[PDB]
């Protein structure tokens, strides 16, 4: 059937929950392919985002799908997504797979004095 | 078994010291040290150009979700460079964690404000500018909370005197309440309680 | 575990009954009536007001009231000028000096507590180890200046020897506990 | 608890609930005021042997934080800080109010 | 002997925010004392602010003008939205306290301060 | 075109807040603090330390306890080198009288010399 | 004892008197100063000397836990009586 | 509350600021028929507890001043770092005592209240279930208090 | 000695009604919209 609420204010429920995660990560594997190969926040979100999106075309199931994610509830997981893709973007215009900018002096992290 | 001694759980330990080193090599460009202490809580120390990124990943990362910021505040250690030490303490709903991510400043470099990643960090920066003067960049606004109004420095600073530098009284002649140097009937005695003995071999710092 | 406070299970669907029920409900006062009452039990129950002062409320041989020096049966000071109350005092409050007596006993010269600065915390007569300083039960000491709250050795010394009944009844009660 | 059955009648029938089981003014089921002296017991380490410090010093084992990596010192699946929090069950004893 | 800027790359633009800073000062002081009912006027108020920015005009660090500038309009916008009051105000001028006068004769016959 | 350059001696004075007087007027001393000789301890001579000068503290007319006028009274500060001690007082703008750190010399310790047979060393008593 | 000064004011028990001259009496002008009478030196005088039986006495000042923490005093000199330096008794060999 | 607060000078002589929980445990052990005195007046305070919900939960005047004021999302309480009876009232399960157990919580069993609507009617029954909750640890806690000792024993 | 000290008694402390409990009394809605009518009708006959 059809999940009557979320049981969380604000949140709308999703009768499409399973294409809208399809395609939320599907934008994400597909602006993580601009990336850098070498970037490890490329490799760890590619493995989570293809470890979800291969549970959701697996699980056809509401419920049986949100126990699997184990993220709350699946409008929480499509939630996840969207911060997710917009957290991508923003690694990108960022590019933190860079060298350390500049190093700390010498007794920056010395606890205690 | 020992009924005095605090019981200790290492899987806690080996789940922070792992997501510690994924932290480190997702951002090296900004994360300068990763720690793991006795009561299990990862502390990741940053330079205060990555706070934005650092900040904006912890909290947006399917692993991190790190949505609640515990609380925002300031150390001052007068001894180093940059003597104002950043802390954020996060907590993730998600994961049943906590973490804390430190990062310096001094009295002329700001730092960026965390106010379009967690909204309670409006009023813990304009807490941490009115107690320490660390300016905080792309502020909604930034301004006294918690001292009096048109209060002259900072007072949580080590060098800032206990009792301040002037106290109010009621003024008959003028009517008003004034602001005086600050005189006390009975000064703050001063106490060294500090032992002239070591008391914890493991921090024995090296001699110069 | 967790409940739910304002949830509520399925639908009681939408009877003429239950509509006429919430009309009358809304039309008449129901629960408008139902408040009346019950606060009209309240207007026949008993009041739970004392007479003070001729009634007092209701204390524990543990209560912290106004600070006393107290004294060994012989009559010699219990106080031995060690200062660990003004070591241990959060909020400074007690200020102590000390000589040699003319027998050569460690006694204090000066012993200053100051009520307006204290915290009545009780960390003074916890911190004292001959059972000298005590915070008796006398709390009815209210004055009309600001000095008078500004105890010294005499003040201390005469409270001690006023509550002296009942402090060291109130130290006999409890000192197993502590 | 000297009120008259008319007013304790009145009382219950306005109040809808049972009122003198329950008086919220106390008046004999309280403890004396003069209680029996206590004996308290005594914590584990009140022995006289196989009781030194050293072996129950936990102040003294705490160490200086491991440090996983520094910048001056210093293929895998990704990992969480902890594993996911369980869903909370429903309440069996009262789930709704 | 290289450092990060704040808002100014040097002292040209850092003036330039004194300037205006004491700009709108010099706009607010008549409307404060209409305002807050002070009993100062509106010329030795304005003489007030003039000698705080001379009393703060020996730094030429850029950072630190630029943090002056800063606090300087937090005061600022503090005085236009009335949150400090006359007391507050007032508490610039010091006329409730005897000063000190400060040649050697008087510091030496009044005590041990310096 | 986002690093300046600065060539000045870091002066905060102006942000500090402190009154004039209570920073030009006052003397601040950087020393590591002598071993209290009543113990042999020497824990408390790890770190440096800046105090204030003394100024004046006089007898209350009603209690007789000790009043100041000084808010730089209980002031230490705390600091791991005597370079750091020298940066925080040039920045907070105080001028600093500052001793060196007085070491213990290494000393000849042998128990055999109190059963010394020509030396003067030799003990009359244990 | 409560002895007054030429002043007529009373003298306290650590010996603190004001001066003819000193302005501070004007706090107790119409009010009085209070000077707790019962003085611990002379009532710790007027206890007779504790005639043991021991060389080494223990002394709690007496009730146990309700009094002073327990010390020991050497009665070696038989030409000065043993003070307890909490309680102030004094103790005395018995040698006959 | 009065009642309560002879409860906590009972135990510390200190009605308000007890100073009675320590680092190591606790100041003092308990008097002899203090679990005694604490069982009678719980035994009874959830009588209170229920006319106090006459007087409020089903007033039409309490409703109208509490329901749908200052709606909170639960996005929005976990942004802006609301935390206790903010985040169970617009419906995030979360509570301390059973997230991140200290003390005996673990040990203990109760429930969490948990909101639906985000407002202040929801936060005020999630406080007065919270109230009830707290009477079930209370209770608990009578019937399972230990013997031993009362502060860690290390001097 | 026997340790004497503040506890439970043994066979535990009786069961506390911590639920909430509204009485749930109170006439009918449509017995009470009857009487009102039936009053209004008596008084304008
Ligand atoms: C009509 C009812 C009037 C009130 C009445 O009779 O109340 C008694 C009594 C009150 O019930 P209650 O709450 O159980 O009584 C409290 C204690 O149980 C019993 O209370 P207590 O034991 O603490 O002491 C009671 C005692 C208290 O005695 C006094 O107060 C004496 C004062 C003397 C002053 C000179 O006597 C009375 O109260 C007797 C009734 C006095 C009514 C006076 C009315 C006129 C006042 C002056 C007007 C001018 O009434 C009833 O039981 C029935 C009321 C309806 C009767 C129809
Ligand atoms: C006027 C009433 C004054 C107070 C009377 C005693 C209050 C307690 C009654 C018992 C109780 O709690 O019942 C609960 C119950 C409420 O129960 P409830 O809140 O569960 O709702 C009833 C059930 N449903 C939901 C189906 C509607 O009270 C009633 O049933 C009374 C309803 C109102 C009756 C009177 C309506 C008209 C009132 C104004 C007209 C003038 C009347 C005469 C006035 C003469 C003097 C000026
Ligand atoms: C009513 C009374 C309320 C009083 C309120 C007082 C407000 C005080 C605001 C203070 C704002 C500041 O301190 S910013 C000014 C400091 N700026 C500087 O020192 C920059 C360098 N200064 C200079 O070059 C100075 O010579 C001048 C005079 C400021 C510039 O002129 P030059 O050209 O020659
Ligand atoms: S009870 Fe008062 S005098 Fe005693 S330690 Fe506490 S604050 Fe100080
Ligand atoms: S702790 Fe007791 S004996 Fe020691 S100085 Fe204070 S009052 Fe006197
Ligand atoms: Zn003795």
């Given at each position: 059937?059809?999940?009557?609420?979320?049981?969380?204010?604000?949140?709308?429920?999703?009768?499409?929950?399973?294409?809208?995660?399809?395609?939320?990560?599907?934008?994400?594997?597909?602006?993580?392919?601009?990336?850098?190969?070498?970037?490890?926040?490329?490799?760890?979100?590619?493995?989570?985002?293809?470890?979800?999106?291969?549970?959701?075309?697996?699980?056809?199931?509401?419920?049986?799908?949100?126990?699997?994610?184990?993220?709350?509830?699946?409008?929480?997981?499509?939630?996840?997504?969207?911060?997710?893709?917009?957290?991508?973007?923003?690694?990108?215009?960022?590019?933190?797979?860079?060298?350390?900018?500049?190093?700390?002096?010498?007794?920056?992290?010395?606890?205690?004095? | 078994?020992?009924?005095?001694?605090?019981?200790?759980?290492?899987?806690?330990?080996?789940?922070?010291?792992?997501?510690?080193?994924?932290?480190?090599?997702?951002?090296?460009?900004?994360?300068?040290?990763?720690?793991?202490?006795?009561?299990?809580?990862?502390?990741?120390?940053?330079?205060?150009?990555?706070?934005?990124?650092?900040?904006?990943?912890?909290?947006?990362?399917?692993?991190?979700?790190?949505?609640?910021?515990?609380?925002?505040?300031?150390?001052?250690?007068?001894?180093?460079?940059?003597?104002?030490?950043?802390?954020?303490?996060?907590?993730?709903?998600?994961?049943?964690?906590?973490?804390?991510?430190?990062?310096?400043?001094?009295?002329?470099?700001?730092?960026?404000?965390?106010?379009?990643?967690?909204?309670?960090?409006?009023?813990?920066?304009?807490?941490?500018?009115?107690?320490?003067?660390?300016?905080?960049?792309?502020?909604?606004?930034?301004?006294?909370?918690?001292?009096?109004?048109?209060?002259?420095?900072?007072?949580?600073?080590?060098?800032?005197?206990?009792?301040?530098?002037?106290?109010?009284?009621?003024?008959?002649?003028?009517?008003?309440?004034?602001?005086?140097?600050?005189?006390?009937?009975?000064?703050?005695?001063?106490?060294?309680?500090?032992?002239?003995?070591?008391?914890?071999?493991?921090?024995?710092?090296?001699?110069? | 575990?967790?409940?739910?406070?304002?949830?509520?299970?399925?639908?009681?669907?939408?009877?003429?009954?239950?509509?006429?029920?919430?009309?009358?409900?809304?039309?008449?006062?129901?629960?408008?009536?139902?408040?009346?009452?019950?606060?009209?039990?309240?207007?026949?129950?008993?009041?739970?007001?004392?007479?003070?002062?001729?009634?007092?409320?209701?204390?524990?041989?543990?209560?912290?009231?106004?600070?006393?020096?107290?004294?060994?049966?012989?009559?010699?000071?219990?106080?031995?000028?060690?200062?660990?109350?003004?070591?241990?005092?959060?909020?400074?409050?007690?200020?102590?000096?000390?000589?040699?007596?003319?027998?050569?006993?460690?006694?204090?010269?000066?012993?200053?507590?100051?009520?307006?600065?204290?915290?009545?915390?009780?960390?003074?007569?916890?911190?004292?180890?001959?059972?000298?300083?005590?915070?008796?039960?006398?709390?009815?000491?209210?004055?009309?200046?600001?000095?008078?709250?500004?105890?010294?050795?005499?003040?201390?010394?005469?409270?001690?020897?006023?509550?002296?009944?009942?402090?060291?009844?109130?130290?006999?009660?409890?000192?197993?506990?502590? | 608890?000297?009120?008259?059955?008319?007013?304790?009648?009145?009382?219950?029938?306005?109040?809808?609930?049972?009122?003198?089981?329950?008086?919220?003014?106390?008046?004999?089921?309280?403890?004396?005021?003069?209680?029996?002296?206590?004996?308290?017991?005594?914590?584990?380490?009140?022995?006289?042997?196989?009781?030194?410090?050293?072996?129950?010093?936990?102040?003294?084992?705490?160490?200086?934080?491991?440090?996983?990596?520094?910048?001056?010192?210093?293929?895998?699946?990704?990992?969480?800080?902890?594993?996911?929090?369980?869903?909370?069950?429903?309440?069996?004893?009262?789930?709704?109010? | 002997?290289?450092?990060?800027?704040?808002?100014?790359?040097?002292?040209?633009?850092?003036?330039?925010?004194?300037?205006?800073?004491?700009?709108?000062?010099?706009?607010?002081?008549?409307?404060?004392?209409?305002?807050?009912?002070?009993?100062?006027?509106?010329?030795?108020?304005?003489?007030?602010?003039?000698?705080?920015?001379?009393?703060?005009?020996?730094?030429?660090?850029?950072?630190?003008?630029?943090?002056?500038?800063?606090?300087?309009?937090?005061?600022?916008?503090?005085?236009?939205?009335?949150?400090?009051?006359?007391?507050?105000?007032?508490?610039?001028?010091?006329?409730?306290?005897?000063?000190?006068?400060?040649?050697?004769?008087?510091?030496?016959?009044?005590?041990?301060?310096? | 075109?986002?690093?300046?350059?600065?060539?000045?001696?870091?002066?905060?004075?102006?942000?500090?807040?402190?009154?004039?007087?209570?920073?030009?007027?006052?003397?601040?001393?950087?020393?590591?603090?002598?071993?209290?000789?009543?113990?042999?301890?020497?824990?408390?001579?790890?770190?440096?330390?800046?105090?204030?000068?003394?100024?004046?503290?006089?007898?209350?007319?009603?209690?007789?306890?000790?009043?100041?006028?000084?808010?730089?009274?209980?002031?230490?500060?705390?600091?791991?080198?005597?370079?750091?001690?020298?940066?925080?007082?040039?920045?907070?703008?105080?001028?600093?009288?500052?001793?060196?750190?007085?070491?213990?010399?290494?000393?000849?310790?042998?128990?055999?010399?109190?059963?010394?047979?020509?030396?003067?060393?030799?003990?009359?008593?244990? | 004892?409560?002895?007054?000064?030429?002043?007529?004011?009373?003298?306290?028990?650590?010996?603190?008197?004001?001066?003819?001259?000193?302005?501070?009496?004007?706090?107790?002008?119409?009010?009085?100063?209070?000077?707790?009478?019962?003085?611990?030196?002379?009532?710790?005088?007027?206890?007779?000397?504790?005639?043991?039986?021991?060389?080494?006495?223990?002394?709690?000042?007496?009730?146990?836990?309700?009094?002073?923490?327990?010390?020991?005093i050497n009665l070696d000199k038989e030409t000065k009586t043993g003070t307890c330096g909490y309680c102030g008794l004094q103790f005395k060999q018995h040698h006959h | 509350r009065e009642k309560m607060f002879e409860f906590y000078?009972?135990?510390?002589?200190?009605?308000?600021?007890?100073?009675?929980?320590?680092?190591?445990?606790?100041?003092?052990?308990?008097?002899?028929?203090?679990?005694?005195?604490?069982?009678?007046?719980?035994?009874?305070?959830?009588?209170?507890?229920?006319?106090?919900?006459?007087?409020?939960?089903?007033?039409?005047?309490?409703?109208?001043?509490?329901?749908?004021?200052?709606?909170?999302?639960?996005?929005?309480?976990?942004?802006?770092?609301?935390?206790?009876?903010?985040?169970?009232?617009?419906?995030?399960?979360?509570?301390?005592?059973?997230?991140?157990?200290?003390?005996?919580?673990?040990?203990?069993?109760?429930?969490?209240?948990?909101?639906?609507?985000?407002?202040?009617?929801?936060?005020?029954?999630?406080?007065?279930?919270?109230?009830?909750?707290?009477?079930?640890?209370?209770?608990?806690?009578?019937?399972?208090?230990?013997?031993?000792?009362?502060?860690?024993?290390?001097? | 000695?026997?340790?004497?000290?503040?506890?439970?008694?043994?066979?535990?402390?009786?069961?506390?009604?911590?639920?909430?409990?509204?009485?749930?009394?109170?006439?009918?809605?449509?017995?009470?919209?009857?009487?009102?009518?039936?009053?209004?009708?008596?008084?304008?006959?």
């Amino acid at each position: 059937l059809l999940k009557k609420t979320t049981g969380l204010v604000g949140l709308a429920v999703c009768d499409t929950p399973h294409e809208r995660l399809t395609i939320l990560y599907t934008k994400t594997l597909d602006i993580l392919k601009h990336f850098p190969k070498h970037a490890a926040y490329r490799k760890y979100t590619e493995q989570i985002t293809n470890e979800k999106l291969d549970m959701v075309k697996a699980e056809p199931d509401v419920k049986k799908l949100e126990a699997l994610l184990q993220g709350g509830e699946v409008e929480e997981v499509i939630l996840q997504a969207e911060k997710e893709l917009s957290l991508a973007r923003k690694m990108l215009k960022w590019k933190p797979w860079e060298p350390l900018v500049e190093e700390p002096p010498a007794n920056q992290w010395k606890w205690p004095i | 078994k020992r009924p005095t001694v605090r019981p200790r759980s290492d899987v806690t330990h080996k789940q922070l010291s792992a997501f510690g080193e994924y932290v480190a090599e997702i951002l090296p460009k900004y994360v300068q040290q990763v720690q793991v202490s006795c009561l299990d809580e990862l502390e990741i120390c940053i330079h205060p150009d990555g706070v934005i990124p650092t900040l904006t990943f912890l909290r947006d990362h399917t692993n991190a979700q790190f949505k609640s910021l515990a609380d925002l505040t300031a150390v001052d250690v007068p001894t180093r460079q940059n003597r104002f030490e950043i802390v954020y303490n996060l907590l993730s709903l998600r994961f049943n964690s906590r973490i804390r991510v430190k990062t310096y400043a001094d009295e002329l470099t700001p730092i960026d404000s965390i106010v379009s990643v967690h909204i309670a960090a409006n009023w813990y920066e304009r807490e941490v500018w009115d107690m320490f003067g660390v300016f905080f960049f792309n502020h909604p606004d930034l301004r006294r909370i918690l001292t009096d109004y048109g209060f002259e420095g900072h007072p949580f600073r080590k060098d800032f005197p206990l009792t301040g530098y002037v106290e109010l009284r009621y003024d008959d002649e003028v009517k008003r309440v004034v602001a005086e140097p600050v005189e006390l009937a009975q000064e703050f005695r001063k106490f060294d309680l500090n032992s002239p003995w070591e008391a914890f071999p493991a921090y024995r710092q090296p001699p110069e | 575990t967790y409940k739910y406070v304002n949830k509520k299970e399925q639908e009681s669907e939408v009877d003429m009954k239950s509509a006429t029920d919430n009309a009358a409900r809304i039309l008449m006062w129901t629960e408008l009536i139902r408040g009346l009452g019950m606060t009209l039990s309240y207007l026949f129950r008993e009041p739970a007001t004392i007479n003070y002062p001729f009634e007092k409320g209701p204390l524990s041989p543990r209560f912290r009231g106004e600070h006393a020096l107290r004294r060994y049966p012989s009559g010699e000071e219990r106080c031995i000028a060690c200062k660990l109350c003004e070591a241990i005092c959060p909020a400074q409050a007690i200020t102590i000096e000390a000589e040699p007596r003319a027998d050569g006993s460690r006694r204090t010269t000066r012993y200053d507590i100051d009520m307006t600065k204290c915290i009545y915390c009780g960390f003074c007569q916890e911190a004292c180890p001959v059972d000298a300083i005590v915070e008796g039960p006398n709390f009815e000491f209210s004055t009309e200046t600001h000095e008078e709250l500004l105890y010294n050795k005499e003040k201390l010394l005469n409270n001690g020897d006023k509550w002296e009944a009942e402090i060291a009844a109130n130290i006999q009660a409890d000192y197993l506990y502590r | 608890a000297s009120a008259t059955r008319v007013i304790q009648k009145l009382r219950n029938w306005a109040s809808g609930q049972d009122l003198q089981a329950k008086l919220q003014l106390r008046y004999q089921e309280i403890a004396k005021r003069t209680q029996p002296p206590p004996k308290l017991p005594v914590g584990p380490s009140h022995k006289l042997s196989n009781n030194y410090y050293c072996t129950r010093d936990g102040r003294r084992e705490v160490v200086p934080p491991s440090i996983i990596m520094s910048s001056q010192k210093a293929e895998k699946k990704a990992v969480t800080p902890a594993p996911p929090m369980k869903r909370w069950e429903l309440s069996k004893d009262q789930p709704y109010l | 002997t290289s450092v990060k800027p704040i808002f100014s790359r040097d002292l040209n633009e850092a003036k330039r925010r004194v300037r205006e800073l004491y700009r709108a000062w010099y706009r607010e002081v008549p409307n404060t004392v209409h305002l807050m009912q002070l009993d100062i006027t509106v010329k030795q108020g304005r003489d007030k602010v003039r000698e705080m920015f001379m009393k703060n005009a020996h730094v030429t660090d850029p950072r630190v003008v630029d943090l002056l500038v800063i606090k300087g309009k937090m005061e600022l916008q503090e005085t236009i939205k009335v949150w400090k009051q006359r007391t507050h105000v007032m508490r610039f001028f010091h006329e409730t306290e005897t000063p000190r006068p400060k040649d050697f004769l008087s510091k030496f016959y009044m005590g041990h301060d310096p | 075109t986002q690093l300046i350059t600065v060539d000045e001696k870091l002066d905060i004075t102006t942000l500090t807040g402190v009154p004039e007087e209570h920073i030009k007027t006052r003397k601040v001393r950087i020393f590591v603090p002598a071993r209290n000789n009543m113990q042999s301890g020497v824990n408390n001579t790890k770190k440096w330390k800046m105090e204030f000068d003394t100024r004046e503290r006089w007898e209350n007319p009603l209690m007789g306890w000790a009043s100041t006028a000084d808010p730089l009274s209980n002031m230490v500060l705390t600091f791991s080198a005597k370079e750091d001690a020298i940066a925080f007082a040039e920045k907070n703008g105080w001028s600093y009288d500052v001793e060196e750190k007085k070491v213990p010399k290494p000393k000849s310790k042998s128990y055999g010399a109190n059963f010394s047979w020509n030396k003067r060393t030799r003990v009359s008593t244990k | 004892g409560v002895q007054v000064s030429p002043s007529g004011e009373k003298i306290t028990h650590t010996g603190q008197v004001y001066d003819e001259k000193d302005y501070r009496r004007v706090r107790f002008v119409d009010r009085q100063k209070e000077v707790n009478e019962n003085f611990a030196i002379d009532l710790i005088a007027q206890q007779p000397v504790n005639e043991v039986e021991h060389r080494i006495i223990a002394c709690d000042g007496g009730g146990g836990a309700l009094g002073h923490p327990k010390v020991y005093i050497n009665l070696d000199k038989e030409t000065k009586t043993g003070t307890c330096g909490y309680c102030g008794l004094q103790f005395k060999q018995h040698h006959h | 509350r009065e009642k309560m607060f002879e409860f906590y000078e009972r135990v510390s002589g200190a009605r308000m600021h007890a100073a009675y929980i320590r680092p190591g445990g606790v100041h003092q052990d308990l008097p002899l028929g203090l679990l005694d005195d604490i069982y009678e007046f719980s035994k009874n305070f959830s009588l209170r507890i229920d006319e106090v919900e006459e007087m409020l939960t089903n007033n039409r005047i309490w409703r109208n001043r509490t329901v749908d004021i200052g709606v909170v999302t639960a996005e929005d309480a976990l942004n802006y770092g609301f935390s206790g009876v903010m985040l169970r009232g617009s419906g995030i399960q979360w509570d301390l005592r059973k997230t991140q157990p200290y003390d005996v919580y673990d040990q203990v069993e109760f429930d969490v209240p948990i909101g639906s609507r985000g407002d202040c009617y929801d936060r005020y029954l999630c406080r007065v279930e919270e109230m009830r909750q707290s009477l079930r640890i209370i209770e608990q806690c009578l019937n399972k208090m230990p013997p031993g000792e009362i502060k860690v024993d290390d001097a | 000695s026997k340790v004497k000290q503040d506890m439970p008694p043994p066979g535990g402390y009786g069961p506390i009604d911590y639920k909430r409990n509204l009485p749930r009394r109170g006439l009918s809605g449509y017995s009470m919209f009857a009487v009102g009518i039936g009053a209004l009708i008596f008084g304008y006959w």
